[PDB]
Coordinates of C-alpha atoms in Angstrom, one line a residue:
Chain C
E1 CA -0.1 0.1 0.0
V2 CA 1.2 3.6 -0.8
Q3 CA 1.5 5.5 2.5
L4 CA 3.0 8.6 4.1
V5 CA 3.5 8.5 7.8
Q6 CA 4.1 11.8 9.6
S7 CA 6.2 12.3 12.8
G8 CA 4.3 12.8 16.2
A9 CA 2.6 15.8 17.9
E10 CA 4.7 18.8 18.9
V11 CA 4.4 21.2 21.8
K12 CA 6.8 24.2 21.4
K13 CA 7.4 27.8 22.7
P14 CA 7.5 30.9 20.4
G15 CA 10.9 31.5 18.8
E16 CA 12.0 27.9 18.9
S17 CA 13.0 26.1 15.7
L18 CA 11.2 22.7 14.7
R19 CA 11.6 20.3 12.0
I20 CA 8.7 17.7 11.3
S21 CA 9.0 14.9 8.9
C22 CA 7.0 12.7 6.4
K23 CA 8.0 9.2 5.6
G24 CA 6.9 7.4 2.2
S25 CA 6.5 3.7 1.7
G26 CA 5.3 1.4 -0.9
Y27 CA 6.2 3.6 -3.9
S28 CA 9.2 5.3 -5.6
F29 CA 9.6 8.4 -3.4
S30 CA 11.6 10.4 -6.1
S31 CA 9.0 9.8 -8.8
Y32 CA 6.3 12.2 -7.1
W33 CA 6.4 15.5 -5.5
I34 CA 5.7 16.1 -1.9
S35 CA 3.3 18.9 -0.9
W36 CA 2.8 20.5 2.7
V37 CA -0.6 21.9 3.6
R38 CA -1.6 23.8 6.8
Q39 CA -5.0 23.7 8.5
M40 CA -5.6 26.2 11.4
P41 CA -8.1 25.0 14.0
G42 CA -11.5 25.2 12.7
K43 CA -10.3 26.5 9.3
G44 CA -9.6 25.4 5.7
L45 CA -6.7 23.9 3.8
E46 CA -3.8 26.2 2.8
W47 CA -1.0 25.3 0.5
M48 CA 2.6 25.9 2.0
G49 CA 4.7 24.7 -0.8
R50 CA 6.2 21.7 -2.5
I51 CA 9.5 19.7 -3.2
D52 CA 10.6 17.5 -6.1
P53 CA 12.8 14.9 -4.3
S54 CA 14.5 13.9 -7.4
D55 CA 16.3 17.1 -7.7
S56 CA 15.2 19.0 -4.4
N57 CA 13.6 21.6 -6.5
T58 CA 11.2 23.7 -4.2
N59 CA 8.5 26.2 -4.5
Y60 CA 6.6 28.1 -1.7
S61 CA 3.3 29.7 -1.2
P62 CA 4.0 33.6 -1.0
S63 CA 2.6 33.5 2.7
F64 CA 5.1 30.9 3.8
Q65 CA 8.2 32.0 1.8
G66 CA 11.0 32.8 4.3
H67 CA 9.2 31.4 7.4
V68 CA 9.6 27.7 6.6
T69 CA 12.0 25.5 4.8
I70 CA 11.0 22.3 2.9
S71 CA 13.6 19.6 2.2
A72 CA 13.9 15.9 1.5
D73 CA 16.3 13.0 1.9
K74 CA 15.3 10.9 -1.0
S75 CA 17.7 7.9 -0.1
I76 CA 15.3 7.3 2.9
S77 CA 12.1 8.7 1.2
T78 CA 11.6 11.4 3.9
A79 CA 10.5 14.9 3.4
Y80 CA 10.7 17.6 6.0
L81 CA 9.1 21.0 7.0
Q82 CA 11.2 23.2 9.3
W83 CA 10.7 26.5 11.0
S84 CA 13.5 28.8 12.4
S85 CA 11.1 30.8 14.7
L86 CA 7.7 29.5 15.6
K87 CA 5.0 31.8 16.3
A88 CA 1.8 31.3 18.3
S89 CA -0.1 31.6 15.1
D90 CA 1.6 28.6 13.7
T91 CA -0.6 26.5 16.0
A92 CA -2.1 24.2 13.4
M93 CA -2.4 20.8 11.9
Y94 CA 0.2 20.2 9.1
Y95 CA -0.4 17.5 6.5
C96 CA 2.2 16.1 3.9
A97 CA 0.8 14.8 0.6
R98 CA 2.0 13.0 -2.4
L99 CA 1.5 15.3 -5.4
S100 CA 1.3 13.1 -8.5
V101 CA 2.4 15.2 -11.6
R102 CA 4.6 12.9 -13.9
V103 CA 3.3 10.4 -16.6
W104 CA 4.1 6.9 -15.4
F105 CA 2.9 4.1 -17.5
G106 CA 2.6 1.3 -14.9
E107 CA -0.3 2.9 -13.2
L108 CA -3.2 5.4 -13.9
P109 CA -1.7 8.5 -12.3
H110 CA -4.1 10.4 -10.0
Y111 CA -2.9 13.9 -10.8
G112 CA -3.0 16.1 -7.8
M113 CA -2.6 15.2 -4.1
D114 CA -3.4 11.5 -4.2
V115 CA -2.0 10.1 -0.9
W116 CA -2.1 12.1 2.4
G117 CA -0.2 11.7 5.7
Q118 CA -2.2 11.4 8.8
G119 CA -1.1 14.9 9.9
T120 CA 1.0 16.3 12.6
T121 CA -0.3 18.9 15.1
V122 CA 2.1 21.7 16.2
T123 CA 1.0 23.6 19.3
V124 CA 3.0 26.9 20.0
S125 CA 2.7 28.6 23.5
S126 CA 4.7 30.2 26.0
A127 CA 3.0 28.1 28.7
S128 CA 4.3 25.0 30.4
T129 CA 2.3 21.9 31.4
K130 CA -0.4 22.9 33.8
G131 CA -3.4 21.0 35.2
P132 CA -6.8 22.7 35.1
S133 CA -8.8 24.5 37.8
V134 CA -12.4 23.1 37.8
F135 CA -15.3 25.4 38.9
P136 CA -19.0 24.4 39.1
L137 CA -21.5 25.9 36.7
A138 CA -24.5 25.6 39.2
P139 CA -27.9 25.2 38.1
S140 CA -30.0 28.2 38.4
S141 CA -32.3 28.5 41.3
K142 CA -35.0 29.6 38.8
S143 CA -34.9 26.3 36.9
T144 CA -38.6 25.7 35.5
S145 CA -40.8 23.5 37.7
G146 CA -40.9 20.0 36.3
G147 CA -39.0 21.3 33.3
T148 CA -35.4 21.0 32.1
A149 CA -32.4 22.4 33.9
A150 CA -28.7 22.9 32.8
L151 CA -25.6 22.6 34.8
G152 CA -22.0 22.0 34.2
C153 CA -18.4 22.7 35.1
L154 CA -15.7 25.1 33.8
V155 CA -12.2 23.5 33.2
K156 CA -10.0 26.5 33.0
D157 CA -6.3 27.2 32.4
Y158 CA -4.6 24.1 31.5
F159 CA -1.8 23.1 29.1
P160 CA -1.4 21.2 26.8
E161 CA -4.4 19.4 25.2
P162 CA -6.3 17.1 26.0
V163 CA -8.5 16.9 29.0
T164 CA -11.2 14.2 29.5
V165 CA -14.5 15.0 31.1
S166 CA -17.1 12.4 32.3
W167 CA -20.3 12.8 34.6
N168 CA -21.0 10.6 37.4
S169 CA -18.2 8.3 36.6
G170 CA -19.7 7.6 33.1
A171 CA -23.2 7.0 34.4
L172 CA -24.5 10.1 32.7
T173 CA -24.2 10.5 29.1
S174 CA -27.4 11.7 27.6
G175 CA -27.5 15.5 27.2
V176 CA -23.8 16.0 27.8
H177 CA -22.2 18.6 25.8
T178 CA -18.3 18.9 26.2
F179 CA -17.2 21.9 24.1
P180 CA -14.0 22.1 22.1
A181 CA -11.2 23.8 24.2
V182 CA -10.4 27.4 23.3
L183 CA -6.7 28.5 23.3
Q184 CA -6.9 31.7 25.2
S185 CA -4.5 34.8 24.7
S186 CA -2.8 33.7 27.9
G187 CA -1.5 30.5 26.0
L188 CA -3.6 28.2 28.2
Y189 CA -6.6 26.3 27.2
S190 CA -10.2 26.4 28.6
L191 CA -13.4 24.5 28.0
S192 CA -16.8 23.9 29.7
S193 CA -18.7 20.6 29.9
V194 CA -22.5 20.9 30.4
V195 CA -25.6 18.6 30.7
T196 CA -29.2 19.1 30.8
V197 CA -31.2 17.2 33.3
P198 CA -34.8 17.2 34.7
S199 CA -35.3 20.0 37.1
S200 CA -37.0 17.7 39.6
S201 CA -33.8 15.6 39.9
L202 CA -31.8 18.5 41.2
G203 CA -32.7 17.9 45.0
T204 CA -32.2 14.1 44.9
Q205 CA -29.6 13.1 42.2
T206 CA -26.0 14.0 42.8
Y207 CA -23.9 15.4 39.8
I208 CA -20.2 15.2 39.7
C209 CA -17.8 15.9 36.7
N210 CA -14.7 13.8 36.5
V211 CA -11.9 15.8 34.9
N212 CA -8.5 14.0 33.8
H213 CA -5.5 15.9 32.4
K214 CA -3.0 13.2 31.7
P215 CA 0.0 15.6 30.8
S216 CA -0.1 17.0 34.4
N217 CA -1.4 13.8 36.0
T218 CA -4.2 16.0 37.4
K219 CA -7.5 14.1 38.4
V220 CA -10.3 16.2 39.8
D221 CA -13.8 15.3 40.9
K222 CA -16.2 18.3 41.2
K223 CA -19.7 18.1 42.8
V224 CA -22.1 20.6 41.2
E225 CA -24.9 21.6 43.4
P226 CA -27.9 24.1 43.3
Chain J
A1 CA -1.5 39.3 -36.0
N2 CA -2.1 36.2 -33.7
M3 CA -2.3 33.6 -36.5
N4 CA 0.8 34.7 -38.2
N5 CA 2.7 35.1 -35.1
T6 CA 2.3 31.4 -33.9
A7 CA 3.5 28.2 -35.1
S8 CA 4.8 24.7 -34.3
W9 CA 8.4 24.7 -33.3
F10 CA 9.0 21.8 -35.7
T11 CA 8.6 21.0 -39.3
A12 CA 5.6 18.6 -40.2
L13 CA 5.6 14.9 -40.3
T14 CA 4.0 14.4 -43.8
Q15 CA 1.5 11.5 -44.1
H16 CA 2.4 9.9 -47.3
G17 CA -0.1 7.0 -47.1
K18 CA -3.6 6.1 -45.9
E19 CA -2.5 5.6 -42.2
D20 CA -3.1 8.3 -39.7
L21 CA -0.1 9.2 -37.4
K22 CA 0.1 7.3 -34.2
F23 CA 2.9 6.2 -31.8
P24 CA 3.4 3.6 -29.1
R25 CA 3.1 5.0 -25.6
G26 CA 6.4 6.4 -24.7
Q27 CA 7.5 7.3 -28.3
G28 CA 6.9 10.2 -30.7
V29 CA 8.3 13.4 -29.0
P30 CA 10.5 15.2 -31.3
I31 CA 14.1 15.7 -30.4
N32 CA 14.8 19.2 -29.0
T33 CA 18.1 20.1 -27.5
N34 CA 16.6 23.2 -25.9
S35 CA 14.1 21.1 -23.8
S36 CA 14.5 19.1 -20.6
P37 CA 13.1 15.5 -19.9
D38 CA 10.3 17.1 -17.8
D39 CA 9.1 18.8 -21.0
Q40 CA 8.8 15.7 -23.3
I41 CA 4.9 15.6 -23.7
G42 CA 2.6 17.0 -26.1
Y43 CA 0.3 16.4 -29.3
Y44 CA 0.3 16.3 -33.0
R45 CA -2.4 18.1 -34.9
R46 CA -3.4 17.2 -38.4
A47 CA -3.6 20.0 -41.1
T48 CA -4.8 19.2 -44.7
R49 CA -4.8 21.6 -47.8
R50 CA -6.6 21.4 -51.0
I51 CA -5.4 22.7 -54.4
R52 CA -6.6 22.5 -58.1
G53 CA -5.3 19.3 -59.6
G54 CA -3.9 19.1 -63.1
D55 CA -7.4 18.0 -64.5
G56 CA -9.4 20.9 -63.1
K57 CA -10.8 19.3 -59.9
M58 CA -10.0 20.1 -56.3
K59 CA -7.7 17.5 -54.7
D60 CA -6.3 17.1 -51.1
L61 CA -2.5 17.2 -50.6
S62 CA -0.9 14.8 -48.2
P63 CA -1.8 15.6 -44.6
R64 CA 0.9 17.2 -42.5
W65 CA 0.9 16.6 -38.7
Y66 CA 2.6 19.3 -36.5
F67 CA 3.9 18.8 -33.0
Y68 CA 2.8 21.3 -30.1
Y69 CA 4.0 20.9 -26.5
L70 CA 1.4 20.1 -23.9
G71 CA -0.8 23.2 -23.0
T72 CA 0.5 25.1 -26.2
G73 CA -0.7 25.9 -29.7
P74 CA -4.3 25.4 -31.1
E75 CA -5.3 22.8 -28.6
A76 CA -3.6 24.5 -25.5
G77 CA -6.7 23.8 -23.5
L78 CA -6.8 20.1 -23.9
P79 CA -5.5 17.8 -21.1
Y80 CA -3.2 15.1 -21.9
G81 CA -5.0 12.1 -23.4
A82 CA -8.2 14.0 -24.5
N83 CA -10.0 12.5 -27.4
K84 CA -10.2 14.7 -30.5
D85 CA -10.1 13.8 -34.3
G86 CA -6.9 14.8 -35.8
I87 CA -5.3 15.0 -32.3
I88 CA -2.9 12.4 -31.2
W89 CA -0.8 12.4 -27.8
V90 CA 2.7 11.5 -27.2
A91 CA 4.7 11.5 -24.1
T92 CA 8.2 10.4 -22.7
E93 CA 7.7 8.3 -19.6
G94 CA 8.1 10.5 -16.6
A95 CA 7.5 13.8 -18.3
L96 CA 5.5 16.5 -16.2
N97 CA 1.8 16.5 -16.9
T98 CA 1.8 20.3 -16.9
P99 CA 1.5 23.0 -19.6
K100 CA 4.8 24.1 -21.0
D101 CA 4.4 27.7 -20.4
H102 CA 8.3 28.3 -20.8
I103 CA 8.3 27.0 -24.3
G104 CA 5.1 28.3 -25.9
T105 CA 4.8 28.2 -29.7
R106 CA 7.2 29.7 -32.4
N107 CA 7.1 33.1 -34.1
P108 CA 8.5 32.7 -37.6
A109 CA 9.8 36.4 -37.4
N110 CA 12.2 35.2 -34.6
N111 CA 12.9 31.6 -35.4
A112 CA 12.8 29.2 -38.3
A113 CA 11.3 25.7 -37.6
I114 CA 13.4 22.9 -36.2
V115 CA 13.8 19.9 -38.6
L116 CA 11.7 17.3 -36.9
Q117 CA 13.9 14.3 -35.8
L118 CA 12.8 11.2 -33.8
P119 CA 15.2 9.1 -31.6
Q120 CA 16.5 6.1 -33.5
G121 CA 14.4 3.0 -33.3
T122 CA 11.0 5.0 -33.2
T123 CA 8.2 3.1 -34.6
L124 CA 6.4 5.0 -37.4
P125 CA 3.2 3.9 -39.3
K126 CA 3.6 3.1 -43.0
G127 CA 3.9 6.2 -45.1
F128 CA 5.8 8.2 -42.3
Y129 CA 9.5 8.7 -42.5
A130 CA 12.0 10.5 -40.3
Chain D
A1 CA -3.4 35.0 -4.3
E2 CA -2.9 34.5 -8.0
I3 CA -5.6 31.9 -9.1
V4 CA -8.4 32.5 -6.6
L5 CA -10.9 29.7 -6.1
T6 CA -14.3 30.4 -4.8
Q7 CA -16.7 27.7 -3.6
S8 CA -20.4 28.0 -3.4
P9 CA -22.4 27.9 -1.2
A10 CA -20.3 27.8 1.9
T11 CA -22.8 25.3 3.6
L12 CA -25.1 22.9 1.8
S13 CA -28.0 21.5 4.1
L14 CA -29.4 18.3 2.7
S15 CA -30.7 14.9 3.8
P16 CA -29.4 11.4 3.0
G17 CA -30.9 10.3 -0.2
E18 CA -30.8 13.8 -1.8
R19 CA -28.5 14.9 -4.7
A20 CA -25.8 17.4 -3.8
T21 CA -24.3 19.9 -6.3
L22 CA -21.2 21.8 -5.2
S23 CA -19.6 24.6 -7.2
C24 CA -16.0 25.8 -7.7
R25 CA -15.3 29.0 -9.7
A26 CA -11.8 30.0 -10.7
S27 CA -10.6 33.7 -11.2
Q28 CA -9.0 32.7 -14.5
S29 CA -9.0 29.6 -16.5
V30 CA -7.4 26.5 -15.0
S31 CA -8.2 24.4 -18.1
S32 CA -8.8 21.0 -16.5
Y33 CA -6.3 21.2 -13.8
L34 CA -8.8 21.0 -11.0
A35 CA -9.1 18.4 -8.1
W36 CA -11.7 17.8 -5.4
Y37 CA -11.0 16.5 -2.0
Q38 CA -13.3 15.3 1.0
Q39 CA -12.4 15.8 4.6
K40 CA -14.4 13.9 7.1
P41 CA -14.4 15.2 10.7
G42 CA -11.1 14.3 12.7
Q43 CA -9.5 12.8 9.5
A44 CA -7.1 13.8 6.7
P45 CA -8.2 15.0 3.4
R46 CA -8.9 12.4 0.6
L47 CA -8.8 12.8 -3.2
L48 CA -12.1 12.3 -4.8
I49 CA -11.7 13.8 -8.4
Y50 CA -8.7 14.6 -10.3
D51 CA -8.2 16.8 -13.4
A52 CA -11.8 18.0 -13.3
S53 CA -13.5 14.7 -14.3
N54 CA -11.6 11.6 -13.4
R55 CA -12.8 9.6 -10.3
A56 CA -10.3 8.4 -8.0
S57 CA -9.5 4.7 -7.2
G58 CA -11.7 3.4 -4.3
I59 CA -14.2 6.3 -4.6
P60 CA -17.9 5.4 -5.0
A61 CA -19.6 5.9 -8.3
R62 CA -22.2 8.4 -6.8
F63 CA -19.3 11.1 -6.8
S64 CA -18.6 12.8 -10.2
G65 CA -17.1 16.0 -11.4
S66 CA -17.3 18.2 -14.5
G67 CA -16.2 21.5 -15.9
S68 CA -13.4 23.2 -17.6
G69 CA -12.0 26.7 -17.7
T70 CA -13.4 28.6 -14.7
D71 CA -16.7 26.8 -13.7
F72 CA -16.5 23.3 -12.0
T73 CA -19.1 21.1 -10.3
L74 CA -18.8 18.2 -7.9
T75 CA -22.1 16.1 -7.9
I76 CA -23.1 13.4 -5.3
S77 CA -26.0 11.6 -6.9
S78 CA -27.5 10.3 -3.7
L79 CA -26.1 11.4 -0.3
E80 CA -25.1 8.6 2.1
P81 CA -24.6 9.5 5.9
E82 CA -20.7 9.2 5.5
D83 CA -20.8 11.9 2.7
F84 CA -21.7 14.7 5.2
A85 CA -18.2 16.2 5.3
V86 CA -16.3 19.3 4.0
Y87 CA -15.2 19.5 0.3
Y88 CA -12.4 21.4 -1.1
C89 CA -11.3 22.2 -4.6
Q90 CA -7.7 22.8 -5.7
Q91 CA -6.1 23.9 -8.9
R92 CA -2.8 22.7 -10.2
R93 CA -2.7 25.1 -13.4
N94 CA 0.1 27.4 -12.1
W95 CA 2.1 28.4 -9.0
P96 CA 1.0 28.9 -6.3
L97 CA -1.2 26.0 -5.9
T98 CA -4.4 27.2 -4.2
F99 CA -7.5 25.8 -2.5
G100 CA -11.0 26.9 -2.5
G101 CA -12.5 27.8 0.9
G102 CA -14.6 24.6 1.3
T103 CA -18.2 23.7 1.3
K104 CA -19.6 21.9 4.1
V105 CA -22.4 19.4 3.5
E106 CA -24.4 19.2 6.7
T107 CA -27.7 17.4 7.6
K108 CA -30.9 19.3 7.3
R109 CA -33.5 19.3 10.1
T110 CA -36.4 21.6 11.1
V111 CA -35.7 25.0 12.8
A112 CA -34.9 24.5 16.5
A113 CA -34.5 27.4 18.9
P114 CA -31.7 27.2 21.4
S115 CA -32.7 27.0 25.0
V116 CA -30.6 29.5 26.7
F117 CA -29.0 29.3 30.2
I118 CA -26.6 31.9 32.0
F119 CA -24.1 30.8 34.6
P120 CA -22.5 33.4 37.1
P121 CA -19.0 32.8 38.3
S122 CA -18.6 30.4 41.1
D123 CA -17.5 31.5 44.6
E124 CA -14.4 29.3 44.3
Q125 CA -13.3 31.2 41.1
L126 CA -14.0 34.6 42.5
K127 CA -11.4 33.9 45.3
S128 CA -8.8 33.3 42.5
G129 CA -9.1 36.9 41.0
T130 CA -10.9 36.1 37.9
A131 CA -14.5 35.8 36.9
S132 CA -16.1 33.7 34.0
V133 CA -19.7 34.2 33.0
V134 CA -20.9 31.4 30.8
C135 CA -23.9 31.4 28.4
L136 CA -25.1 28.2 27.1
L137 CA -27.2 27.8 23.8
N138 CA -28.5 24.1 23.7
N139 CA -29.5 22.0 20.8
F140 CA -30.5 24.5 18.1
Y141 CA -30.5 24.4 14.3
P142 CA -29.5 26.1 12.0
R143 CA -25.8 26.8 13.1
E144 CA -26.0 30.6 12.7
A145 CA -26.5 32.2 16.0
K146 CA -25.5 35.6 17.5
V147 CA -24.6 36.1 21.2
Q148 CA -24.1 39.6 22.7
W149 CA -23.2 40.3 26.2
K150 CA -24.4 43.3 28.3
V151 CA -23.1 44.4 31.5
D152 CA -25.3 47.2 33.1
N153 CA -27.2 47.4 29.7
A154 CA -23.8 48.2 28.0
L155 CA -22.6 46.1 25.0
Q156 CA -19.3 44.2 25.5
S157 CA -16.8 43.4 22.9
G158 CA -13.4 41.9 22.7
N159 CA -13.6 40.0 26.1
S160 CA -15.7 36.8 25.1
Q161 CA -15.1 33.6 23.2
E162 CA -17.4 31.1 21.7
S163 CA -17.2 27.4 21.2
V164 CA -19.5 25.2 19.3
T165 CA -20.1 21.5 19.1
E166 CA -20.2 19.5 15.9
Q167 CA -23.5 18.5 14.5
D168 CA -25.3 16.0 16.9
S169 CA -25.4 12.4 15.5
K170 CA -28.9 11.9 17.3
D171 CA -30.8 15.0 16.5
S172 CA -28.6 17.1 14.1
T173 CA -28.6 20.1 16.4
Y174 CA -25.7 22.3 17.5
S175 CA -24.9 23.7 20.9
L176 CA -22.8 26.7 21.8
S177 CA -21.0 28.2 24.6
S178 CA -20.1 31.9 25.1
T179 CA -17.7 32.8 28.0
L180 CA -17.2 36.4 29.1
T181 CA -13.8 36.8 31.0
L182 CA -13.5 39.6 33.4
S183 CA -11.1 40.6 36.4
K184 CA -12.6 40.1 39.8
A185 CA -12.2 43.8 40.2
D186 CA -14.2 44.6 37.2
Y187 CA -16.9 42.0 38.0
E188 CA -17.7 43.5 41.6
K189 CA -18.2 47.0 39.9
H190 CA -21.4 46.2 38.0
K191 CA -24.7 44.6 38.8
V192 CA -26.5 43.3 35.8
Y193 CA -25.1 40.7 33.5
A194 CA -27.0 39.5 30.4
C195 CA -26.4 37.4 27.3
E196 CA -28.8 38.1 24.4
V197 CA -29.3 35.4 21.9
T198 CA -30.3 36.0 18.1
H199 CA -31.4 33.0 16.2
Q200 CA -33.9 31.9 13.2
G201 CA -36.0 29.9 15.6
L202 CA -36.5 33.0 18.0
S203 CA -39.2 35.5 16.8
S204 CA -37.4 38.0 19.1
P205 CA -34.0 37.6 20.6
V206 CA -33.9 36.0 24.0
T207 CA -31.9 37.1 27.1
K208 CA -30.9 35.5 30.2
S209 CA -29.6 37.7 33.0
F210 CA -28.8 37.9 36.7
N211 CA -28.0 40.3 39.4
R212 CA -24.5 39.9 40.9
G213 CA -25.0 38.6 44.4
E214 CA -28.3 36.9 43.8

């Protein structure tokens, strides 16, 4: 099978250099170009540039010229993407892709980016590893009679991703919403997890959110009460 | 004067018999010492003219086939391998499947045509010679 | 930059079983050098169609592409649940290679107004010197919603962030959180905190408010 396997997630600080890689298998690496593509969180695909490994001829998008360097070691079928000075705004997913452009007779060439790596995340922040603080989002004292209430927990100021959130040790799953984390201007992440429940159960059923942050080995159980 | 300012870089392959031009996949790109291996891909386009024969009737002359690099010439918009009467495709294996924007066509006021030559051992249909 | 690709519409809202037609228009001709990609949630992009009209190996027959020059179309003859994804076009006619902005194909459902909840900062957080006020918009459709924060009936800007779930697999709704971040000092200066929610399903915008200190 034709495959591209990228190097693992990176967590860096602004100004550091960084090189990530992309290893080809099951095909003649020098017979196809390699393209690099950026996807900012929540955003679209953006072309960064490409390299022909046969002669290491490169081209860059005008937006990335001078901020990154693309290279390749064709004898070990590996392409590279390198930054001299990461910015917080380089926080993104990076893909490498085989860019098929040559006429080869032994197969029907799929001209374009026909095989993709699985992607490498790069997180750039001045922060260091830190476990979250967990605050209750307590159900309103004006929750409607015999209706539906909302409650949750705020998981604030942790680094890096991910955190895990469950409710009542996995016993409560219906109506849970755990929102995507937001990387704040401080360089720390924050998110909320919420659940809707019957208003009548508020005085009988206990609600506890279980928060795990494996990078800091932080485990928190927060009871959320009216 | 677009039509007068544009031409094939090469002289024509004249069709001397009843067989249309065609080449095995991998063969047929004219030799050009001003091009690189990446560039070796394009098409031949048929042209036929008519003149008054010695007996008063209009007659067809032998057809001429002219080579244009991919993405240039009268069928500049066609992708490699598109099917069209009077158009046949040629490529050297490994050529870039990209328009040859750095080659373009020939302006006769600037350059004479290159005598079309093919690598020794090229297979040509009956009635074609080079 | 250089050849600009424009995709229409930005969102297509359809149901499984229906035909999808996606548009890509280029600012100048790309002849046939146009490809289409699909990106499913949490996954890498995948090639669907290469050089305008050729279906990639492994791609189901219900996908097809057509067009040349500046106007291109991707058609999905009958949508399957796995086809709800984002689709991107990309030209290789000339440097720099460029992508269109993407068309999201999402599941259609009836209009569902958000139920709105507001959460004051907890006493625990107040001790720490910061205050977060959270506004929850629960199970709504369509995705477009506006949240405005008012503090003493004054409009806030620059001090709030939103986060939105992906479309729910069960009921096809979205949920959304807006968090207003204030210093403890700023929080204890004002009384009335409110989030106003504007949405297609609300005939008038809905606000939830509280007075600091209950």
